[PDB]
Amino acid sequence: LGGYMLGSAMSRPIIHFGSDYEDRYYRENMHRYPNQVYYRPVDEYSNQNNFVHDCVNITIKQHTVTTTTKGENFTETDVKMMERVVEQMCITQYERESQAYYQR
């Protein structure tokens, strides 16, 4: 991700999966999960979901490297959760920047 910036922080969101079980699951380990994501500005790339799938898999694959580097191993269940959280972050960043860039 050598050329990626880092957008703003936010408080932990709540991802309401469809079950209290998964809501708890996220809650247990959300402090190990990321708080921010990596992407580029709306300068050239400039898509919505096709940027989200990139920023997410950038921010998720970087975690699935550093976990293994530390000899930890967040499972594919943890990945599936963080996919959502990182999507919510990345969409929140896109929309905030949109209303400072597109709303120009």
CB 25 within 8 A of CB 58: no
d(CA 8, CA 36): 7
For residue 14, give the nearest of 5, 4, 23, 1 by alpha carbon.
23
In the chain the beta strands, taken as DSSP E runs, fall at: 5-6, 38-39
CB 55 within 8 A of CB 38: yes
Q: Solved by what technique?
A: NMR
Region of 43 please: left (phi>0), alpha (psi -120 to 50) or beta: alpha
CATH code of the domain made up of 1-104: 1.10.790.10
d(CA 9, CA 45): 22
Question: Tokens 């959760």, residue?
Answer: 81
